[PDB]
Symmetry: C3
Subunit: 149 residues, 3 copies
C-alpha cells in the first residue's frame, strides 16, 4: 500500500517523524577527534522494491559540528538495524579541554569536571542526528556493449 513499515528493535529506539524522516540515536556516545563509529538507531524499515532509502546527514548538526555522516544507502527490503556511519572529522591537535560539545557545537557543562580531548562531541540517546529520505531506484538489466546506440 502507500505506507512504510517501521520496526523498533529496542526500548531505546524512537519512531521517525516527518519532507525527510528525523532519525534518533538509540545510544549515548562520545567521539574523539578523528574517531569513526556506527551509531545504532535500534530501528529497522522494510523499503519496497523500486525504492532506495537514504540515511543522510542533518543540516543543523553537520553544518555546525565536525560530525560527518557518510550517507547510507538502505536497499529495498533490508530489515537490519539502521546504523549511522559517522566520523568526528575534527583534527586531532593533541590539545585538551574540560568541555564536551553537543550536536550544536555548544559546550557541555560538567558538574563533575573531566579532561577531554579538544574537539570531542557527545551524542545523547534520543537526539536528532540524521534523517531518512526515500527515493525511487532504477534497476535495468545490464548489456555488454562494444559501442552505444
Amino acid at each position: 500500500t502507500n505506507t512504510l513499515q517501521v520496526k523498533l528493535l529496542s526500548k531505546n529506539a524512537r519512531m521517525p517523524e516527518r519532507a525527510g524522516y528525523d532519525i534518533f540515536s538509540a545510544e549515548t556516545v562520545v567521539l574523539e577527534p578523528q574517531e569513526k563509529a556506527v551509531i545504532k538507531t535500534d530501528v529497522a524499515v522494510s523499503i519496497p522494491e523500486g525504492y532506495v532509502g537514504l540515511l543522510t546527514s542533518r543540516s543543523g548538526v553537520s553544518s555546525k559540528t565536525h560530525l560527518v555522516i557518510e550517507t547510507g544507502k538502505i536497499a529495498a527490503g533490508y530489515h537490519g538495524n539502521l546504523g549511522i556511519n559517522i566520523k568526528n572529522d575534527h583534527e586531532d591537535d593533541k590539545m585538551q579541554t574540560i568541555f564536551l560539545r553537543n550536536i550544536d557545537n555548544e559546550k557541555i557543562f560538567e558538574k563533575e569536571r573531566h579532561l577531554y580531548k579538544l574537539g570531542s562531541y557527545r551524542i545523547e540517546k534520543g537526539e536528532r542526528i540524521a534523517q531518512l529520505v526515500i527515493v525511487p531506484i532504477w534497476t535495468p538489466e545490464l548489456k555488454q556493449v562494444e559501442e552505444f546506440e
Copy 2:
C-alpha cells in the same frame, strides 16, 4: 506546471544553468585549513511537493581541491536562501605560504604579496562551486510494526 521557480535574493545572486543546475557563489570568501562555513548563493527555490532538491558537490572542484561540500537536502517548498555547506578539509599542518589556491587548486598570484596558511582556498563571487539536482521523494505514512509482512 513543468517549471521550477527561482528567486534572486540579492544583486550578488546568479541564475542557475543546465543535467544538473550549476550554482554560483554570491560572496568572495577565504577558507583556512579545516575551516567550516556556509556560503550564501543569494538564491531561493520553490520545489514542488513530491520532490527533494540536492545541493551537491561539483566534480571538478571537489576532485581537484580539499573543498568538501556536504550535500544539502532542499525540502519541497523551502523558500530560504540556499547555502553551501562547505569545509576546507585540508590538514592544518601549521605551515605558511604566499599563495592562495583557487577552486582549481592553482596558485593565485598576488600583486600585493601576503602570508597565508598552507592549504587555503579562495572562492570568488560568481564562481561555479556547486550544483542543484532535483529528484522525486517518497513520503508514505509510518506504521509501527512488530514484524514485517
Copy 3:
C-alpha cells in the same frame, strides 16, 4: 528499452553486478594519509535522459576505513570512463609502519617488508570499492520570479 548499456574500456575493467550495482577498481593504487585520487573503473555507461547515476560509497569499506568517496553524479548520456573520487582522510600524523591496510582495514602482510606511512591503504585491481545507484532526475525550465505563488 528497460536495459542499461555498459561499455568496458579496458581488459582491466569489470562488469557491474546487482539493488545497487557493485563497481570494481581497474587499477592497484596506494593512498597515503590525506592523499586524493581518481580511481579509474575503465567502465562507461549510457544513462538515458530523465535519469542521473550515483557513483556512491560502499558501506563496508567506508565505515571500516578512512577511504572517503565523494559521490559522483553521472549525468544522463555521459559516456566517459567512470572514476572514483576518493580521499584517504586518515590524519597525517607523520608516524611509520610496515603494514598497508586493505579495504577491510586489516593489515597486509608483506613477504618483502617495507616502510609505509601510518594510515595508508591499498586498493587492489578488481576490488569492490564503490557502487552505482541510478535515480530519476527532474529537469524543469527555470523562471525568474520576484515572489513565489
